[PDB]
Amino acid sequence: AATSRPERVWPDGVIPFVIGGNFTGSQRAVFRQAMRHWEKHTCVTFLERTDEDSYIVFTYRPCGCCSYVGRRGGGPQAISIGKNCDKFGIVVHELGHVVGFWHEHTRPDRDRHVSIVRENIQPGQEYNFLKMEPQEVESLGETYDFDSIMHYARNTFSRGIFLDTIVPKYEVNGVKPPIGQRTRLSKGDIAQARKLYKCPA
Ligand SMILES: COc1ccc(S(=O)(=O)N(Cc2ccc3c(c2)OCO3)[C@H](Cc2cccs2)C(=O)NO)cc1
Numbered sequence: 001a002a003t004s005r006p007e008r009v010w011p012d013g014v015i016p017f018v019i020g021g022n023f024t025g026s027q028r029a030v031f032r033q034a035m036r037h038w039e040k041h042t043c044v045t046f047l048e049r050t051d052e053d054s055y056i057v058f059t060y061r062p063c064g065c066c067s068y069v070g071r072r073g074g075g076p077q078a079i080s081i082g083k084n085c086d087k088f089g090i091v092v093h094e095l096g097h098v099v100g101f102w103h104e105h106t107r108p109d110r111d112r113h114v115s116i117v118r119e120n121i122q123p124g125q126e127y128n129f130l131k132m133e134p135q136e137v138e139s140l141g142e143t144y145d146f147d148s149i150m151h152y153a154r155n156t157f158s159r160g161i162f163l164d165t166i167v168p169k170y171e172v173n174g175v176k177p178p179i180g181q182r183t184r185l186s187k188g189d190i191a192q193a194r195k196l197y198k199c200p201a
């Protein structure tokens, strides 16, 4: 679900950042690990902010919606970390939003790939599952990525742990593909990010 908006691509892949106070050294290490992970697989770079108008601010706040997707023009944007959403994989995901990705399951073509089980969604949270409008996403010729760091789990925003809100429609290597990994950038995330930022081969 890569943004179609050219203004939302960070020029030259350069993303200035500020780490807010109140973070422990341990937490700051995770932020650096997450940023270096992006840097090591793509041409995106993170720079300590000096006088740039647009930059990201690691902010210590309760977990939940919402992040700005891509570069916000004319002011900073928060990347929010809380007690229960501070691990490497979650920060990598949030940096996915920063660079310009919406949630994978909201791709305009997602109905070919997953079913949404509406009756299992937490009332009021259905907006989490609405497709991006077709003009808001340019997938850059890349197929739907079940392994994406940006993909929800099977039971995200569900009425219960054992009730699925998202069910892949078909088998890959004999089984329905697992979704919602928060280990690392997928092969798909990297290929697509490289296209989005026009990274040198
Ligand atoms: C429409 O935009 C948003 C943006 C952010 C959020 S969120 O609540 O902050 N959250 C949803 C989430 C929780 C658990 C998950 C999941 C997605 O996938 C695997 O398991 C995550 C961050 C969090 C992790 C744990 C608690 S909150 C997210 O998508 N951030 O971008 C919700 C909606």
Ligand SMILES: [Zn+2]
Binding pocket: 093, 094, 097, 103
């Ligand atoms: Zn997210």
Ligand SMILES: [Zn+2]
Binding pocket: 001, 002, 104, 142, 143, 144, 145, 148, 188, 189, 192
């Ligand atoms: Zn993708």
